[PDB]
């Protein structure tokens, strides 16, 4: 299953959403207060996902959308703090670059060259998606040098 690992890649990491869609009974936070916290965290430069984690561990908010009705990114969009490049793609490029970095120096390292090939492959593969779905500028390309100056 796990993408681009043929043969044995296949296993199940967890998350399982409970049945109750209604927010939990012990939870006393107004959806507005939540949107406030999430936006504060956001302006502090966090990720929709990282925000999710923070709200869940510290703040007793299990699922933000079952509280608000808006998923985290949509909230970020309406309220104007927006993560210009999708967190998703962002990390993939950060990675491909860390591999660039390490690889320019150790030029005899073959595994890391191959890993890079894989990661860049995924990056293009995500680009197509975010392009056809209008989440990325149409002429936007990942190059070594272009993407290195691209907010990553």
């Amino acid at each position: 299953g796990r993408m681009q690992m043929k043969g044995k890649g296949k296993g199940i990491s967890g998350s399982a959403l409970p049945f109750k869609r209604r927010s939990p009974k012990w939870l006393h936070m107004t959806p507005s207060t939540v949107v406030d916290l999430s936006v504060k965290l956001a302006k502090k430069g966090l990720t929709p996902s990282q925000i999710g984690v923070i709200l869940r561990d510290q703040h007793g908010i299990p699922q933000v959308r079952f509280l608000t009705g808006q998923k985290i990114l949509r909230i970020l969009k309406k309220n104007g703090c927006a993560p210009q490049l999708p967190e998703d793609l962002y990390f993939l490029i950060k990675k491909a670059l860390s591999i660039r970095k390490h690889l320019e120096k150790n030029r005899k390292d073959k595994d890391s060259k191959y890993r890079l090939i894989l990661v860049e492959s995924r990056i293009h593969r995500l680009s197509r998606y975010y392009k056809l779905n209008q989440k990325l500028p149409p002429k936007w390309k990942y190059n070594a040098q272009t993407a290195s100056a691209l907010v990553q």
Partner: protein, 80 residues
């Protein structure tokens, strides 16, 4: 004797969370009382990284692998 439609509780509890009928999670949320300043906070069962109580800044929980380590004299109750 077995019925797929009325599976037995003690069995489903034993099964992996994805292999149950309702596909229900194993995590909880807990109210935790700081040993020092006696503040109550909410903590996710498998919570990531570390938690410090907001009043006195002392350490409540430590991260692992799905367990959180409640540190020292911090008392807790599961919320449900």
């Amino acid at each position: 004797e077995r019925d797929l439609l009325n599976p037995i509780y003690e069995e489903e509890k034993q099964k992996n969370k994805f292999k149950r009928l309702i596909q229900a999670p194993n995590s909880y949320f807990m109210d935790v009382k700081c040993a020092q300043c006696q503040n109550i906070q909410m903590i996710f069962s498998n919570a990531q990284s570390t938690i410090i109580c907001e009043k006195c800044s002392a350490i409540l929980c430590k991260p692992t692998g799905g367990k959180v380590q409640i540190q020292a004299g911090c008392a807790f109750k599961i919320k449900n």
